[PDB]
Amino acid sequence: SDEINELKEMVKDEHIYDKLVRSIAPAVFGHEAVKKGILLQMLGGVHKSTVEGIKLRGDINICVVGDPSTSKSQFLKYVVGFAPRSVYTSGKASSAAGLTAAVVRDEEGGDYTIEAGALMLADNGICCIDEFDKMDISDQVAIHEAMEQQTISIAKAGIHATLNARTSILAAANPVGGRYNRKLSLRGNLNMTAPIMSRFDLFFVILDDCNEKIDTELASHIVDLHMKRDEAIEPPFSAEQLRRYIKYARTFKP
């Protein structure tokens, strides 16, 4: 009954949805668009199956794509340290086989078996990724089934199996030319095929442009960070009570 009071507070307050969203990236400056996109990530859908016919996905896959110095890797190397059971992979260093599932031999029975991989051991948690563009298609392919069909299926070395990977994913690839010509359009500017461009049920092409009433604030912010003493960064909700509040809210299936 005690902790019920704590939730009762953090849920009966009026502006929680705002109090939350501006309190997901205490270090990062602003980006109230993306921070929203993340807060919704950790709070999945319902994944409730249809009539016995088929089952449909119930998870969200935000996929940032930003110009240089947009603090897009900070969101990841934060989430993967705050979202439960998560994993951070640079992608281009990794391979597609490693990402979905591995087949390997064991001496116990002299038989082939499964290596969980990032996707299967990332079940019911966000599996963030970096630099899609750098990941050659040979590994971009191995994800699709963990996007919409929600489950991986593998037929190798005699073993046929299928493992369900209910895993939110993410991304942080950079545009084609590192930074992307405002001149050019967006079509011939992302360098990624149609499907994997669609399966991402968010999209955030983050820009980076000049200003004064912005860049001054940003610089003051970064400085205050590097001025440890000026860690006034305390947001309303700590990075802990947010966890318990989620672990509650994960259960409503409206």
Ligand X SMILES: Nc1ncnc2c1ncn2[C@@H]1O[C@H](COP(=O)(O)OP(=O)(O)OP(O)(O)=S)[C@@H](O)[C@H]1O
Residue 69 assigned to a binding site: yes
Can residue 74 be called a binding residue for ligand X (CB under 6 A)? yes
Q: Which is nearer to ligand X, 61 or 174 (CB)?
A: 174
Residue with smallest beta-carbon separation from ligand X: 73
Can residue 29 be called a binding residue for ligand X (CB under 6 A)? yes
Q: Which is nearer to ligand X, 222 or 249 (CB)?
A: 222
Radius of gyration of the chain (CA): 20
Cβ at position 225, least distance to ligand X in Å: 7
* Segment contacting ligand X by CB under 6 A, of 11-19, 84-92, 189-197, 214-222: 214-222
> Applying CB under 6 A, what is the total number of residues that bind ligand X?
13
Can residue 71 be called a binding residue for ligand X (CB under 6 A)? yes
Can residue 70 be called a binding residue for ligand X (CB under 6 A)? yes
Can residue 69 be called a binding residue for ligand X (CB under 6 A)? yes
- Distant-in-sequence, close-in-space partners of 44: CB < 8 Å, separation ≥ 6: 58, 59, 60, 168, 250
Can residue 35 be called a binding residue for ligand X (CB under 6 A)? no
Task: Report the residue from 20, 174, 175, 202 that binds ligand X according to the rule CB under 6 A.
Answer: 174
Residue 230 assigned to a binding site: no
Can residue 218 be called a binding residue for ligand X (CB under 6 A)? yes
Nearest to residue 62, comparing CAs of 82, 42, 78, 32?
Answer: 42
Can residue 223 be called a binding residue for ligand X (CB under 6 A)? no
Taking residues 120 to 149 in sequence order and writing x for each that binds ligand X by CB under 6 A, - otherwise, the string is ------------------------------
Q: Under the rule (CB under 6 A), what is the footprint of ligand X?
A: 28-29, 68-74, 174, 218, 221-222
Binding residue positions? 66-73
